[PDB]
Amino acid sequence: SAKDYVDTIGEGTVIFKGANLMGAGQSFKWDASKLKFGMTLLFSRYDAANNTPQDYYYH
Amino acid sequence: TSINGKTGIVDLFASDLDAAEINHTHAEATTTESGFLSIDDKEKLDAI
Amino acid sequence: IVDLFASDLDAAEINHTHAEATTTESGFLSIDDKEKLDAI
Amino acid sequence: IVDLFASDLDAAEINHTHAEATTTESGFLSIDDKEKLDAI
Amino acid sequence: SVFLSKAQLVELAGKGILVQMPSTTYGDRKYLYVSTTGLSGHFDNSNYAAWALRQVTIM
Numbered sequence: 267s268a269k270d271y272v273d274t275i276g277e278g279t280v281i282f283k284g285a286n287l288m289g290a291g292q293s294f295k296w297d298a299s300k301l302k303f304g305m306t307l308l309f310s311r312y313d314a315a316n317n318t319p320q321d322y323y324y325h
Numbered sequence: 326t327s328i329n330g331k332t333g334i335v336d337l338f339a340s341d342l343d344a345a346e347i348n349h350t351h352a353e354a355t356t357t358e359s360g361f362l363s364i365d366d367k368e369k370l371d372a373i
Numbered sequence: 374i375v376d377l378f379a380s381d382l383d384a385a386e387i388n389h390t391h392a393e394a395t396t397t398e399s400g401f402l403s404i405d406d407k408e409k410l411d412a413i
Numbered sequence: 414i415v416d417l418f419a420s421d422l423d424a425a426e427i428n429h430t431h432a433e434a435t436t437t438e439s440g441f442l443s444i445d446d447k448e449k450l451d452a453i
Numbered sequence: 454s455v456f457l458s459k460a461q462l463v464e465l466a467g468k469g470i471l472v473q474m475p476s477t478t479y480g481d482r483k484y485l486y487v488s489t490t491g492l493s494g495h496f497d498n499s500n501y502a503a504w505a506l507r508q509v510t511i512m
């Protein structure tokens with residue numbers, strides 16, 4: 267059970283996947299208990315007009 | 326499977342492969358970098 | 374099976390030249406201009 | 414995953430230079446030539 | 454040092470990532486296609502021979 271707890275900690279609860287610009291008004295929230303190790307943020311290219319998730323140039 | 330992260334019906338160009346076009350211009354020649362001869366320099370050379 | 378080059382990709386070749394610089398457009402330095410500059 | 418690039422496809426790069434002009438072949442203007450032209 | 458996590462791995466499996474080199478001039482972007490199964494070589498950083506990997510560690 268302890269191993270299960272640590273591996274679900276390791277897996278990480280993905281809170282967002284897809285496309286988002288999050289200018290003045292869009293934000294993502296969490297809980298004080300939910301934070302144990304940190305967050306992982308992955309970025310890539312967008313399209314100003316097409317608004318399509320260009321599938322290259324990650325970070 | 327994919328080229329530069331592109332899949333399916335894909336048309337690649339020079340800028341897609343970080344390449345220059347046929348009709349592309351370079352940085353003009355300065356005192357520190359080589360480049361294309363400026364119009365003013367050519368006019369001065371012709372006048373001299 | 375298809376082969377593509379820079380010309381097929383509307384791109385400049387690695388071993389390519391450029392138009393000589395004129396009084397209206399920039400470009401490479403002509404041989405005569407270089408000789409005149411050296412002789413001056 | 415054939416990630417083709419201009420280096421192996423005989424395509425001139427976006428950030429690429431040209432050889433300095435000589436007495437037999439054209440090219441980019443040298444620093445010394447520009448300095449001499451400015452001084453003259 | 455660059456870090457990539459399990460959730461980012463799953464969301465990035467089959468995709469590539471490029472990194473920007475701390476230096477005095479912009480450039481030296483190293484692009485490679487890392488997935489949870491291994492690595493695929495995006496050899497656009499071969500020209501950028503001024504900087505290359507030293508090691509990779511699996512956590």
Ligand SMILES: [Fe+3]
Nearest residue numbers: 345349385425
């Ligand atoms: Fe060129």
